[PDB]
RNA sequence: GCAGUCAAGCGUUCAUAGCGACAUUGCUUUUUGAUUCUUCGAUGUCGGCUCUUCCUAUCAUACCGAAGCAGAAUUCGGUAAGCGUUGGAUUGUUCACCCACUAAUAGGGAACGUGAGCUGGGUUUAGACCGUCGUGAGACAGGUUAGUUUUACCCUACUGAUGAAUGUUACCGCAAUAGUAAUUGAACUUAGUACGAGAGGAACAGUUCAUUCGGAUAAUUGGUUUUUGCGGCUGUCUGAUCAGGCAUUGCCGCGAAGCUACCAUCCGCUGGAUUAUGGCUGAACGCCUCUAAGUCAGAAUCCAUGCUAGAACGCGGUGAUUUC
RNA sequence: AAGGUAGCCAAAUGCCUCGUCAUCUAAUUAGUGACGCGCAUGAAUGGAUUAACGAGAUUCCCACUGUCCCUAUCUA
RNA sequence: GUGAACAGCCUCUAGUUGAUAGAAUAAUGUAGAUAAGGGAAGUCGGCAAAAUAGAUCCGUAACUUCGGGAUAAGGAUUGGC
């Protein structure tokens, strides 16, 4: 998550290793996000860094506005297709993988989010919650 | 030359050798330190693992996100019928270690205990303890002398107890006998307590209570001969590998010109002695109590046994202990429950647990009904009942 | 404790059982087991599956 | 390659906080040479992959000393190898060079560890092309493309598994010795506080989680299907129907049990003695001094507690011990 | 004896060399397009260009996947 | 018989029923297979495997020696009665 996070997050099953491409759910002009790193990841030989709901990643825009391409920017995952278990015993998952472009502090580059947003991500990042319409 | 990249070692070297346990009943190698300013009590108990189920409770932990919120947890149920005290043993301190000095047995022993002393019970004359019982035929002078010797010399007192295997759905018929150390009181008080409990039963609720941390000692599930990949968790070799890929590629350098003890090798997996600590008790159940699986919220009348019974075990008809999490060993295996060796105050202990719901759906499939009455209410009347 | 209802079959869902599916339009679906979820993913219609609650209501069984 | 000695000078003043010319004394065998002792009736040859252990000249983590150390950050040094030291683009590469995460991305050894462990991209047989050289056959530590990687059943080592003989047999125990394990980060709070003109900006205790690792476990979720359990479908065969055979498990959907996944859940203890260092009392030396006698506190260190095995030539307690 | 013309190139031919610029990527000793005092390109020792074809040698993209993250299970 | 078919698959005539056997179902193999989320991050290199596939209808670029490229690419449909 890096700096700017409010509180901590219970562990969520990882489903987005490095190299995954997820949809862009904001209106910044990007159409997909290509994850190159995960903030706060550990070290293990041969193990790919992987991200889950609410994590902050480093991504590059592959499709979208020309000014957003060919550069590295932080992003926050807001939807996850890999199923995970909540502490109330519920296993759940989304239809797609989605993220939003942000800054190192967590402030959103855009101003609107399309589609549902996971509850864990909204609580961790106050800026995402403000721009989200429906949580879960 | 040095290895190209650094990685931590595979496996724990303190759990060596990975051989089969000497007996199916795992040994208790450490008892709690005795405090002799307390009443005499047992320090462990014997039970049989029946199975696992699920509970719902409200979390009481300030600062947690799920504070004052329901959580779903897995628990393990241990069938714990009362044990029978049938003897006592005294130990003397020695420069070479603790040594057993005297053993005194009860006057009468049931067929459950006597089967433990035989390998061919059906053919034997059943002569065990026949001459020893004659020591009670007189006024007990022989028994009094041995008990006096324990009081005079012993520094550690343990009691011999056996399970009531006939009360379980198991087909063994042969009870398990074990020593349990007595903590609290003087040596004379320990011996008097043991003597008065000959041929008596001790219930589990006199040993353990609600919201108490206990340790589980048992022999793990066996799996036979196992390769290195699953036995130690080594990386699988590439698909191109000739001569097989579920192996360790290099088992040692040229020098020393020997295979070292710290290299992963294929061999026995499972059936090892294990001691796992800090397992909180969620419920101490009573066998004669109807509505064993009922809470103050559910209010329905149902036992702890799931619909169709515990898979491969049967029904629970005696006292039981419900413990949070998982326990070493498989179903139908004798387990030993031990009190904590230290006082835990991590705020995960000492917290009061209040169960709100206990799952009693069938574990033989995707069970969807808690009770037979609920099933009747949903499906209605079937062709068989009309 | 709260008991939910299977979206495909109408079966009761106790805590911990089944999965929860959030569709793209932010519609929430509950399934008691993997069979109903698999039939939902195959786009089967519950009114033509004989053992479902909706089928029994439609045919007045 | 690494480390000392001396101190002209650098450092606003100020040799030695941190550096240090001219000279000089060493250490190391992770460079390359020098040599030709061993091997040409053959010790398989580059790199990577995999796995274990060792060294400390310590990158990070623990505890400290010093500063041109206000705070924050950094720099020099000590005890310390207990514990970690990564994911990728290009290259056959060792090396190198960038991107990124991270507490950190420290340097090395083990026949330049490791080919009856793999792989065969490179080098280094025979085919072929190019450039330069040669009259030519051909040469090139120049470039390019294609080119068979054999054997363990023996001994030992290692991992597990039995077992004669200690009157017989059975049950309950003791513990010599050997092994041993946990690890690191973030957020909240302390606190916009101490400190500082300001800009900036901590720490101890407390709480909630997470990283790496380890040991188990299968209630739940996911995976697996010869349950060939139920249903469906194609071709053909048994006259039709019913019910079946064959298609090397015919195919598809669901699918209990078992096994199993940081793709699931649970658990991973606390006492003593010390190192560096900071002190007490106190001489030598009428004073002064942590040291000489004595003595206090003290590190991820050590030994125990705890955990695993149980000497098959270590040991104790207890039951029953045969008449054709 | 004449001194490399037309073309072409760090090309299977360039030592220096991972040449310089541009493009491709988050990052390229790779690829491509240019540049040429070219160690040592060059005209039937054939130069340059070419549709179609190739179990030939290379680079990138889409689809695809147990190659991999990270292993698990079943049959003979 | 199915089908475009001397393809694969099943059957009639005819011919064989031969290849050391019994028991058990550890590791490692050989052969055949399936996988949540990600999708070449693996590797010298997509090696291996997967995906595509018949027929009818629609639609088809640069370039070209005008013959091709071409099944380019990209879509739709398919049973029974
Ligand atoms: Cl270890
Ligand atoms: Cl020549
Ligand atoms: Cl196998
Ligand atoms: Mg044992
Ligand atoms: Mg091979
Ligand atoms: Mg079950
Ligand atoms: Mg020889
Ligand atoms: Mg050799
Ligand atoms: Mg040889
Ligand atoms: Mg070597
Ligand atoms: Mg070889
Ligand atoms: Mg070798
Ligand atoms: Mg060899
Ligand atoms: Mg080669
Ligand atoms: Mg050759
Ligand atoms: Mg495991
Ligand atoms: Mg022994
Ligand atoms: Mg040139
Ligand atoms: Mg070029
Ligand atoms: Mg000419
Ligand atoms: Mg036809
Ligand atoms: Mg898959
Ligand atoms: Mg999938
Ligand atoms: Mg790659
Ligand atoms: Mg790689
Ligand atoms: Mg291929």
Helix content class of chain B: 10-25%
Query: What's the shape of chain B?
Result: globular
In percent terms, what proportion of residues of chain B is strand?
25-35%
CATH class descriptor name of chain A: Mainly Beta
* Radius of gyration of chain A from CA coordinates: 14 Å
PDB class: ribosome
Keywords: RPL39L, ribosomal protein, ribosome
Entry title: Mouse RPL39L integrated into the yeast 60S ribosomal subunit
Chain A: 60S ribosomal protein L23-A
Word description of this protein:
- The PDB classes it as ribosome.
- Keywords: RPL39L, ribosomal protein, protein exit tunnel, ribosome.
- Mouse RPL39L integrated into the yeast 60S ribosomal subunit.
- Chain A is 60S ribosomal protein L23-A.
- This is part of a larger assembly, with chains A (about 140 residues), B (about 375 residues) and C (about 60 residues).
- Chain A is mostly beta strands and about 140 residues long.
- Chain A has helices spanning about 120-125, 125-130; strands at about 15, 20-25, 30-40, 50, 55-60, 75-80, 85, 90-95, 100.
- In chain A, the strands form three sheets. Chain A has a five-stranded mixed beta barrel. Chain A has a two-stranded antiparallel sheet with strand order 1-4.
- The longest helix of chain A is centred in the C-terminal third of the chain and has 6 residues, at about 120-125.
- The two termini of chain A are about 20 Å apart.
- With about 375 residues, chain B is an alpha+beta fold.
- Chain B is about 10% helix and about 25% strand.
- Chain B has six helices and 15 strands.
- In chain B, strands 1, 4, 5, 6, 7 and 8 form a six-stranded antiparallel β-sheet that branches. In chain B, strands 2-3-13-12-9-14 form a six-stranded antiparallel barrel.
- Chain B starts with about 40 loop residues before the first strand and ends in a 7-residue tail after the last helix.
- In chain C, strand 3 and strand 4 form a beta hairpin.
- Chain C is an alpha+beta fold.
- Classes of the chains: A mainly beta (about 140), B alpha+beta (about 375), C alpha+beta (about 60).
């Amino acid at each position: 998550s890096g700096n700017g996070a409010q509180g901590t997050k219970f562990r969520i099953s990882l489903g987005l290793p490095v190299g995954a491409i997820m949809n862009c759910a904001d209106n910044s002009g990007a159409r997909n996000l290509y994850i190159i790193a995960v903030k706060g990841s550990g070290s293990r030989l041969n193990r790919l860094p992987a991200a889950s709901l609410g994590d902050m990643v480093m991504a590059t825009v592959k499709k979208g506005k020309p000014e957003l391409r060919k550069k590295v920017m932080p992003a926050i995952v807001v939807r996850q297709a890999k199923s995970w278990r909540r502490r109330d015993g519920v296993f759940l998952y989304f239809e797609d993988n989605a993220g939003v472009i942000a800054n190192p502090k967590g402030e959103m580059k855009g101003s609107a989010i399309t589609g549902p947003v996971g509850k864990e991500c909204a609580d961790l990042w106050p800026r995402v919650a403000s721009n989200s319409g429906v949580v879960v | 030359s040095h290895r190209k990249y650094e990685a931590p070692r595979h496996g724990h070297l303190g759990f060596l050798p990975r051989k089969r346990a000497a007996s199916i009943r795992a040994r208790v190698k450490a008892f709690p330190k005795d405090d002799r300013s307390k009443p005499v009590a047992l320090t462990s108990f014997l039970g049989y693992k029946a199975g696992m189920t699920t509970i719902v409770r409200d979390l009481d932990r300030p600062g947690s996100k799920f504070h004052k919120r329901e959580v779903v947890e897995a628990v393990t149920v241990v069938d714990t019928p009362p044990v029978v005290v049938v003897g006592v043993v005294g130990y003397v301190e020695t420069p070479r270690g603790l040594r057993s000095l005297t053993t005194v047995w009860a006057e009468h022993l049931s067929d459950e205990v006597k089967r433990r002393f035989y390998k061919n019970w059906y053919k034997s004359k059943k002569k065990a303890f026949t001459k020893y019982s004659a020591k009670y035929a007189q006024d007990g002078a022989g028994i009094e002398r041995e008990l006096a010797r324990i009081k005079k010399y012993a520094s550690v007192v343990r009691v011999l107890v056996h399970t009531q295997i006939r009360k379980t759905p198991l087909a063994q018929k042969k009870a398990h006998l074990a020593e349990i150390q007595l903590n609290g009181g003087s040596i004379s008080e320990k011996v008097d307590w043991a003597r008065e409990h000959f041929e008596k039963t001790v219930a589990v609720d006199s040993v353990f209570e609600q919201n108490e941390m206990i340790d589980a000692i048992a022999v793990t599930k066996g799996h036979g001969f196992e390769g290195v990949t699953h036995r130690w968790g080594t990386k699988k070799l590439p698909r191109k590998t000739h001569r097989g890929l579920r192996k360790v590629a290099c088992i040692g350098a040229w020098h020393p010109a020997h295979v070292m003890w710290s290299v992963a090798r294929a061999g026995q997996r499972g059936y090892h002695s294990r001691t796992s600590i800090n397992h909180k008790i969620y419920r101490v159940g009573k066998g004669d109590d109807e509505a064993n699986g009922a809470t103050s919220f559910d209010r329905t009348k149902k036992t702890i046994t799931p619909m169709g019974g515990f898979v491969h075990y049967g029904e629970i008809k005696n006292d039981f202990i419900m413990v949070k999490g998982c326990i070493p060993g498989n179903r139908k295996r004798i387990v030993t429950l031990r009190k904590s060796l230290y006082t835990n105050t991590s705020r995960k202990a000492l917290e009061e647990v209040s169960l709100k719901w206990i799952d009693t759906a069938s574990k033989f499939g995707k069970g969807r009904f808690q009770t037979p009455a609920e099933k009747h209410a949903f499906m209605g009347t079937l062709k068989k009942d009309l | 404790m709260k008991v939910e209802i299977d979206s495909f079959s109408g079966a009761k869902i106790y805590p911990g059982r089944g999965t929860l599916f959030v569709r793209g339009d932010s519609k929430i679906f509950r399934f008691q087991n993997s069979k109903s979820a698999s039939l939902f993913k195959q786009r089967k219609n519950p009114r033509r599956i004989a053992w479902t609650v909706l089928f029994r209501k439609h045919h007045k069984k």
